[PDB]
Amino acid sequence: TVVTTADTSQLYALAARHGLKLHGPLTVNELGLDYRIVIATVDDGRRWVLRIPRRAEVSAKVEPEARVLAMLKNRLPFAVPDWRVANAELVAYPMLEDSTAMVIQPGSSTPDWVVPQDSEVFAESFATALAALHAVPISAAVDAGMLIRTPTQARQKVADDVDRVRREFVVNDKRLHRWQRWLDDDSSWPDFSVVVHGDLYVGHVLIDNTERVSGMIDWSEARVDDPAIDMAAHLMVFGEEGLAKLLLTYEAAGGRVWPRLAHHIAERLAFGAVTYALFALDSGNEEYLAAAKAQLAAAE
Numbered sequence: 106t107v108v109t110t111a112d113t114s115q116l117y118a119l120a121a122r123h124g125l126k127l128h129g130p131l132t133v134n135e136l137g138l139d140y141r142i143v144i145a146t147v148d149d150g151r152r153w154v155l156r157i158p159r160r161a162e163v164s165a166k167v168e169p170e171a172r173v174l175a176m177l178k179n180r181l182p183f184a185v186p187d188w189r190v191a192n193a194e195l196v197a198y199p200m201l202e203d204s205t206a207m208v209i210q211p212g213s214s215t216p217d218w219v220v221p222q223d224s225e226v227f228a229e230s231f232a233t234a235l236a237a238l239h240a241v242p243i244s245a246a247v248d249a250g251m252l253i254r255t256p257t258q259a260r261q262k263v264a265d266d267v268d269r270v271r272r273e274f275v276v277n278d279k280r281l282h283r284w285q286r287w288l289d290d291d292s293s294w295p296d297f298s299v300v301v302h303g304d305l306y307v308g309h310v311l312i313d314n315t316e317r318v319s320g321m322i323d324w325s326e327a328r329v330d331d332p333a334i335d336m337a338a339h340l341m342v343f344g345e346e347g348l349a350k351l352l353l354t355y356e357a358a359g360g361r362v363w364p365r366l367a368h369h370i371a372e373r374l375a376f377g378a379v380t381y382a383l384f385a386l387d388s389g390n391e392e393y394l395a396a397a398k399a400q401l402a403a404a405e
């Protein structure tokens with residue numbers, strides 16, 4: 106008798122209700138506010154990811170998300186989760202065994218590793234993979250029931266998010282001015298939307314052992330919206346140097362750009378403070394809320 110974090114009996118029963126027979130080693134992440142994520146071995150000798158919604162309001166997202174992934178599968182030259190099980194109580198897919206492009210121990214505030222700035226294979230393949238994603242036709246997104254934002258709707262969403270933060274929190278005056286100026290700066294904003302991943306950073310990108318992008322995961326924020334949404338974290342991790350390389354190759358690979366794209370991406374990155382604060386507020390988590398309030402009040 107040894108106490109373990111995972112409830113093997115309950116997990117076995119849950120998986121078996123959906124055609125999966127668990128057998129062998131498993132791993133459990135409950136840091137997620139909305140899902141328990143288990144990597145478990147099944148009787149096919151293979152590891153599967155069990156993505157377990159915690160509550161009814163999370164379960165409600167499974168059906169639309171499943172439609173997105175089904176559409177994306179043939180239209181991307183890289184892997185995405187294959188949700189062979191997709192229901193309100195359980196999503197499950199064969200694990201995409203390639204590593205994420207950032208490795209971190211659960212709970213830790215410091216990664217063990219991030220794919221290096223000087224990895225040209227990563228930089229180049231991320232840029233072409235991103236062009237490929239952003240080339241998925243709008244029609245395919247509509248046919249799959251995706252959330253669609255025109256450029257006007259995209260800008261309105263940012264305005265709404267800023268306004269909600271301004272109502273719920275006390276924000277440094279310079280941040281408020283920055284966001285307002287951005288919202289009013291016509292030349293920053295794109296005149297088109299594309300299919301975006303929506304929560305894209307190195308931790309959601311898979312790479313083969315040569316550091317070539319081979320997949321992307323965690324697609325819950327996917328939608329048709331401002332392309333720069335998917336470039337902010339690249340700027341955050343790889344700096345202006347990395348961003349410059351990305352935009353050159355992205356454009357060469359057929360990605361649509363506009364003159365003030367680099368500027369707009371930096372403003373999108375600054376807007377991450379809004380996204381975080383609203384995440385914190387909606388989470389009800391007090392540690393996240395404390396961090397958000399401290400960030401918002403602080404000068405950038």
Ligand SMILES: CC[C@H]1OC(=O)[C@H](C)[C@@H](O[C@H]2C[C@@](C)(OC)[C@@H](O)[C@H](C)O2)[C@H](C)[C@@H](O[C@@H]2O[C@H](C)C[C@H](N(C)C)[C@H]2O)[C@](C)(O)C[C@@H](C)CN(C)[C@H](C)[C@@H](O)[C@]1(C)O
Pocket residue numbers: 207209213214215216219304305306307308326337338341342377378380381382384
């Ligand atoms: C480069 C590695 C680092 O990675 C980053 O900083 C990312 C670019 C960052 O992301 C950056 C950039 C960007 C564009 O998201 C990709 C922006 O929206 C946010 C808020 O911050 C991530 C994705 C954030 O997590 C995102 O927080 C959103 C509020 C919700 C979103 N998801 C669940 C919908 C979630 O993925 C988060 C808020 O940092 C998560 C937080 C709980 C834990 N962090 C503090 C860790 C330790 C990170 O510092 C990191 C892993 O070491």
Ligand SMILES: Nc1nc2c(ncn2[C@@H]2O[C@H](CO)[C@@H](O)[C@H]2O)c(=O)[nH]1
Pocket residue numbers: 142154186199200201202203204205308309311322323
């Ligand atoms: N390498 C890999 N990690 C995954 C996969 N699915 C989920 N994860 C991890 O679990 C988290 C939650 O889905 C992700 O952000 C990754 O850390 C996968 O198919 N492959």
